[PDB]
Structure 1
Amino acid sequence: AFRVLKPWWDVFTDYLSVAMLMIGVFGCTLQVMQDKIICLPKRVQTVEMKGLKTDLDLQQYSFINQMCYERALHWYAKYFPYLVLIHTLVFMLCSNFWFKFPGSSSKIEHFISILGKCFDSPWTTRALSEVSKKEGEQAKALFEKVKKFRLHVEEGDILYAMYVRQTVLKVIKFLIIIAYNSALVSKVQFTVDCNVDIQDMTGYKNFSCNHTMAHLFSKLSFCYLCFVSIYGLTCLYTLYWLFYRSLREYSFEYVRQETGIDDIPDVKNDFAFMLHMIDQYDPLYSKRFAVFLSEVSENKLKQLNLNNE
């Protein structure tokens, strides 16, 4: 189960990435339009006014339009949606980066399988009733399974460090995106002074142009900037929650406070990290899984099984 190991901030970032992809696709379809920039030459040769004849054909106007689109419009105003698509693709790929690793996937699947089968175990409810037959043998087998999990997962710390790496990658990518987008968002202007030297072709040298979708691209850039800022705030909170409490150390003393048996130990490394995942999801899962960690609880279960047999 890969949905359960995803906290609220991860789903929020996934939906923000989906919205950013939609913005990029809309910008690309905006760039599909043929009519992009409209240019007019400068210094052309009850008050009644008369029009200024520029003595230019339609083809000369089209040539001026394309020359000023290529050599006067800023590269950001032309290739913003493609950059948005690339950035949102990299953001989406790195969202499940700690999910797709082989060992990470194996330990996550083992944890969710063990936790789910513990959740439908009658003896968990039996031990909760004790705190506040055949199923005894199943509980003994599940205790050996929990010990196997402790030997199989706790020796490593790949998951927490790899999650920290993915979150740091998200934070730095948000920083770079915000930086260059704030630096280049002022380049998307309506009126552009185009100064291409096509005087030998059209007769004029200075042109004043307008980018027709400059306002729409500016609004799209500001919306993308707001989305990236929300993404960065979410990732900054993720970094704060990751680093303010040591996820290499899960204190089960909160279980010890209301539950009388004190034998359950303080798990370390990957076990503590994934238990913090499940605590962010639902703390009842951890408070129930706590009772399967003790050894004197196993001895009491063995005593009950000996009485039954």
Structure 2
Amino acid sequence: AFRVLKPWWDVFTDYLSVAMLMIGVFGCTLQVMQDKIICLPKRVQTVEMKGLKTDLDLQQYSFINQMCYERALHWYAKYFPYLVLIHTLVFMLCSNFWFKFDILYAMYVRQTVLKVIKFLIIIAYNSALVSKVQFTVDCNVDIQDMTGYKNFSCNHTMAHLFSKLSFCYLCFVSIYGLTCLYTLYWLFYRS
């Protein structure tokens, strides 16, 4: 049993990585649902209101749905759980890297530094690209030849859920990086 040589930071990171995998599985299940985006045209042809007749079939609506999923929605907004799953696989692979490997000190600080830089890169990229998960999307695909409308407004059904999942994911990686930075401080504070 290596639990004696497993301090609190390693066990905390293990449980956090399990949480990462659970979050990624939940996000993949969210992406499993067929109904992803819902698109309606713009400028479509007490006061009584009347519904606007878009003059569109079901399959035309589905076509605009997938087209605006293609060319208007952000790639991170479409594969955020995908990146989450890949990156937690990387986390559990390189979390036991020192265990699965002055050479002892060397590979231990190598593991800590690799974990720290992965954490920092994840923080930078997530903080940069998290704002792109929006509900109201403006889509300007050129399918006027088939539908008749050149501009569309769409809604991403689970965009709020992806933003909340990204907030929880960022909190988890934040605790991860705080405990790993404490590990690095303890390692490099003394010889």
- With normalisation by structure 1, the TM-score equals 0.61
Q: Deviations over 1:255-306 (max 9, x none)?
A: xxxxxxxxxxxxxxxxxxxxxxxxxxxxxxxxxxxxxxxxxxxxxxxxxxxx
Tell me how far apart the structure 2 counterparts of residues 46 and 192 of structure 1 sit (CA, whole Å): 31
Partners of 2:59 and 2:115 lie apart in 1 by: 48
Report how many aligned residue pairs link the two structures. 190
TM-score normalised by L of structure 2:
0.98
Cα shift at 1:12: 0.3
CA distance in 1, matches of 2:56, 2:2: 64
List runs of 5+ in structure 2 lacking aligned partners. none
**Structure 1 residue 46 displacement after superposition:** 2.5
Shift of 1:95: 1.0
Q: Distance in 1 between matches of 2:83 and 2:74?
A: 14
Deviates more, 1:29-38 or 1:42-51: 42-51
Whole-Å separation in 2 of the counterparts to 1:94 and 1:7: 17
Shift of 1:205: 0.5
Report Cα offsets for 1:204-236 as digits up to 9, x if no partner.
010000000000000001111111111111111
CA distance in 1, matches of 2:20, 2:96: 17
Report the alpha carbon displacement of residue 187 of structure 1 after superposing the two structures with TM: 0.4
Structure 2 distance, partners of 1:49, 1:239, is 65
TM-superposed deviation, 1:165: 0.3
Q: Give the SS at the match of 1:210.
A: strand
1:278 corresponding residue in structure 2: none
Displacement after TM superposition at 1:241 (Å) = 0.7
SS of aligned partner of 1:39: strand
For the pair 1:85 / 2:85, whether they are aligned, the reply is yes
Cα distance in 1, alignment partners of residues 172 and 17 from structure 2: 8
CA RMSD of aligned residues (A): 0.7
Please give the secondary structure, in 2, of the residue aligned with 1:47. Answer: coil
Structure 1 residue 47: deviation in Å?
1.7
- Of 103, 106, 121, which residue of structure 2 is paired with 1:176? 121
The offset of 1:192, in angstroms, is 0.4
**Higher RCO structure, 1 or 2 (CA under 8 Å, sep 6+):** 2
Q: Deviations over 1:25-72 (max 9, x none)?
A: 100000000000000000101221111001111111000001001111
Q: Secondary structure at the match of 1:48?
A: coil
Distance in 2 separating the partners of 1:34 and 1:184: 24
Tell me the equivalent position of 1:48.
48
Which residue of 225, 242, 258 maps to 2:187? 242
C-alpha separation in 2, matches of 1:27 and 1:171: 25
How far did 1:3 drift?
A: 2.1
CA distance in 2, matches of 1:90, 1:46: 61
Identity score, percent: 100
User: How far is the alpha carbon of 1:176 from its aligned partner?
Assistant: 0.4
Q: How much does 1:179 deviate?
A: 0.5
1:75-99: CA deviations, max 9, x gaps?
Answer: 0110001100111111111111111
Unaligned runs of 5+ in 1: 101-156, 247-309
Cα drift, residue 183 of structure 1: 0.6
Q: Look up the SS of the partner of 1:98 in the other structure.
A: coil
Distance in 1, Cα, partners of 2:119 & 2:87:
10
Deviations 1:147-173 (A, max 9, x none): xxxxxxxxxx21111010000000000
Match for residue 74 of structure 1? 74
Rg larger in 1 or in 2?
Answer: 1
Q: Which has the higher helix share?
A: 1
CA deviation after TM superposition for structure 1 residue 238, in Å: 0.6
Q: Distance in 2 between matches of 1:96 and 1:2?
A: 11
Q: Secondary structure at the match of 1:200?
A: coil
SS at match of 1:53: coil
